[PDB]
Structure 1
């Protein structure tokens, strides 16, 4: 509360560390369904069903332009990619499987780096 703070966690490296994690996502061989925005004109239903589209290149652009206030807002966008994927894709598809794999991959890098 006012004049009462927890000890200050060092957050000066967070921007750089998030960039590294994102680089490792981008270079994963199962990254291909998530590298660019889903084409809202060539995929029937996507625009209407998925209210908040997100993809790695958009995350990269937001990261590089100071649009994430903190660590956590970055992780929310990453998770949004895989939540969107689960909403639109059957678990038993290549894209469905890519999503589960990538989420797992992310959550480990996340835990190892910050938790």
Structure 2
């Protein structure tokens, strides 16, 4: 149907915008601390602490499969990256502090992204 194609175009456009957002957020992690999943080989107790791991590579996989239906779902995953890190690591660590900086700087990006998603009407 034509309506289905139109919806898929909207999702494709949302995916394009989120790809831009993802690139901007990842730039606020210059250390690449959040680039990949935490290694369960190197950190074997991680899943005892963190029930829903997340990282930028995993987000990118879901994004390219057009697996984010709206901005809220995307933000949920970004918040997992930050929140997981701030629980597993103590305040006085390079990991926790990287998460705080990513949260603070990323908030600016996500604030305007919400306006753009609403404005263009991608949901």
Q: For this structure pair, what is the TM-score category when the shorter chain's length is used for normalisation?
A: 0.7 to 0.9
State the match for 2:119 in structure 1.
none
Identify if the C-alpha distance between structure 1 residues 12 and 38 changes in structure 2 by more than 3 Å, giving closer, same or farther.
closer
**TM-superposed deviation, 1:61:** 0.4
Q: Does 1:110 align with 2:122?
A: no
Identify if the C-alpha distance between structure 1 residues 78 and 29 changes in structure 2 by more than 3 Å, giving closer, same or farther.
closer
Residues 36, 56 of structure 1: 8 Å contact kept = yes
> Number of paired residues?
106
Identify if the C-alpha distance between structure 1 residues 87 and 110 changes in structure 2 by more than 3 Å, giving closer, same or farther.
same
Deviations 1:2-31 (A, max 9, x none): xxxxxxxx8874322211111122233535
State the match for 2:121 in structure 1.
none
State the match for 1:37 in structure 2.
37
State the match for 1:72 in structure 2.
72
Which consecutive unaligned segments of at least 5 residues does structure 2 have?
A: 1-9, 116-123
SS at match of 1:113: helix
Higher relative CO (CA 8 A, sep ≥ 6), structure 1 or 2? Answer: 2
Paired residues for 1:21-36 under 5 Å: 21-36=21-36
State the match for 1:98 in structure 2.
98
Per the normalisation by structure 2, the TM-score is: 0.77
Q: Does 1:20 align with 2:31?
A: no
Deviations 1:14-56 (A, max 9, x none): 3222111111222335351100000012114212111000000
Per the normalisation by structure 1, the TM-score is: 0.82
Moved more, 38-47 or 21-30: 21-30
CA RMSD of aligned residues (A): 1.9
> Comparing both structures, which one devotes a greater share of its residues to helix?
2
Q: Does 1:89 align with 2:89?
A: yes
